[PDB]
Amino acid sequence: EKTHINIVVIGHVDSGKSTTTGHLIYKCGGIDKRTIEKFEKEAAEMGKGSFKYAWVLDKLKAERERGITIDISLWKFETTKYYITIIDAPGHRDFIKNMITGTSQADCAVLIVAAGVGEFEAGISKNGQTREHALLAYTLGVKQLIVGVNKMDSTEPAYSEKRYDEIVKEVSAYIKKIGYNPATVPFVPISGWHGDNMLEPSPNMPWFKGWKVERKEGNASGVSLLEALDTILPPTRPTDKPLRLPLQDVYKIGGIGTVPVGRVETGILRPGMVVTFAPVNITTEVKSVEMHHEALSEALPGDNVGFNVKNVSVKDIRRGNVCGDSKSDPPQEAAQFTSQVIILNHPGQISAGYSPVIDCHTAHIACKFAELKEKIDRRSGKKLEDNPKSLKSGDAAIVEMVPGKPMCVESFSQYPPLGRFAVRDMRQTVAVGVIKNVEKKS
Template identity: 30%
Template sequence: MAAPKQMDILRFATAGSVDDGKSTLIGRLLYDSKSIFEDQLESVERTSADRGEEYTNLALLTDGLRAEREQGITIDVAYRYFATPRRKFIIADTPGHIQYTRNMVTGASTADLAIILVDARKGILEQSRRHAFLTTLLKVPHLVVAVNKMDLVGYEQGTYESIVDEFTAFASKLDVADLTFIPLSALHGDNVVERSVNMPWYEGPSLLHHLEHVHIASDRNLIDVRFPVQYVIRPHASTDPELHDYRGYAGQVAGGVLKPGDEVVHLPSGLTTTITHIDGPGGPVDEAFAPMSVTLRLADEIDISRGDMIARPNNRPEVAQDLDAMVCWMTPDRQLTPRMKVVLKHTTRTAKAMVKELNYRLDVNTLHRDESAQSLGLNEIGRVSLRVTQPLFVDDYARNRLTGGFILIDEATNNTVAAGMITGAK
């Protein structure tokens, strides 16, 4: 009997301006793909009826916080999961308000695809441009512009095409690898799961069809082997004599493909060895690649600990203490200023760091660089130079999002204050 086919997972985030219909779109995807429980649907139908709404308010499926339901907006990042016979999906429904930009960055940072909703009546707004820029800054490989509420403009082709032209002109200033436009109505389900009969002039796929078929396998870096060590497994207490001498290095593959017999190098020591076994959650595996979590066993006993890196001898990450990076400041309690001290967490390594200088603050609406800026406030983005107290094993964020990304932590409160993307190291 053939083994069941392993379905891949598509992580996608929704973004856009306030009231563009992000939560309703996700609710429609869940509803039309029959991915919600009956009691959930009954609760939403009952709440909609109590409010006197004409239609079942599918946005209630994702707006889980009481404050969101009271205000009718999305505040936090709401994660939802569903599957079709072709693919599994993880959805991050991110906020549209400008004051919650940091939440949008959080949701999009791990996404394979981003859906930016645009209200067909309003066209491209400031927040639409902001979120489009952020998705490209975060190197989200695929971007879908969903022109929503087409029912409110009579499904007019001209309205849709003018939005496509305007967004295409804006996107030409950005680094967009894959851009797709889809006209739809989340409220009525036009072009969400099934092709719409109301827009015969549109010849492309429905949104769900695009999500099921977009190619993501080549988006992952399968060239540069990167394995940050998270934990050293030594089961000394085991009564099994075979496990008594077991020494394994557990972690999540951040890049490349690892196989037993491969020669690897340990950083920071620079010592080379060979992989003898790769253990997965269900037992030995023949190969490991991102984002698999595995345990490596090596031929030689090397002093390896959490925060170290395993790579290829002839393909190593940069070993650096001075970093240039784009940073999104995420806390309202204080501002980023030159000479401030923070804790930097990069893969599995944590070290103290200092902001050497703020090179410029970026206006994400105009893409203007303010080189006179003295600080970064909540939700602001800028380029900074950092000095770290111990070497990190890094790649440019454009090459590897896992080894090129980091967070900054407040030493006093232990709160995450910023997310960063490495643009250079030395």
């Protein structure tokens, strides 16, 4: 019973994602050497060129398409502390969508960054994907980030400390601005190609004594990339987060009173708690909690429960309101929210003002796309334009949104089940999205 970990590999195109990932798979014995060859030969037939290592990540991306997993046993490998699985990487039709719909869900993002001359500079430029990729992971609340500083073999000189330092520094400042805390991220210099420093230290890099993480949960340190992999913190576990319980229904049960029903998404609900309902802003005390027609002292995450509340009318709270704890990040009305969406098969064209209904947790409310803030390439996460005038089917984007009626939502990283939504026009699912920030009301 080692715990399961999900890894997403990101980084700018040609920075070395498939190479590194494939090498790692090879070196960890997840596939037998015979079977590694079948797929090497097979890849060569299929494409012009050599696919040693890379075929692994390429097969993976391709097996995350249209919406069937048939097998993922090749992508599972064992470290000392975890069973790790590679989930997905940028560079295919569905990447953004898999990320956004949670069909591909990750506990950590390995961000590959290329150290070769001009390579790092391209990834981090206006045409590069390094920032976007980091930004995307953060948005999806992947709070564990490892940075693999790759192709060290081909710096100027080979394996330059100075170059490693320069990348660690510049990349640290960006991931800071973005919201990660740099000190928690292992910056590991490596060569995906030769293998340097993936499983043990490399004779080529004697100047490198190792990396140090400092987190809330305590310090850790190592040399290789395997060791970084094993300092990954697990989630954060819903039970330990403040209460969030979106309202499915509200009944008036005779000689008992108002009884809201819902799934505890995060936190504990218990009889006694004085809870708050957003966005109606009403605080009151839970007389009791029922599940399977039986009193509960605790309602845990995943529990569907009735709870009787004193002094509230059935007309005061409704489906889609959100209940939480009044003395622990009580829920609030969303004045507006910023999100990342991928537009699926629409009719035509969307502009500031478009107001479809947003289905989020148990709410169903029309929201205005106030500002269209970025268009984003769905294959790659690459940003393709600031304030685009209009979006259309196939685009990913970043949009600002203003709820038409009062609504309560949460950012996807704080409260996932309250941070993912679908966008709807009649029976049309036009978009799916996740919520970056939310401006709370007063």
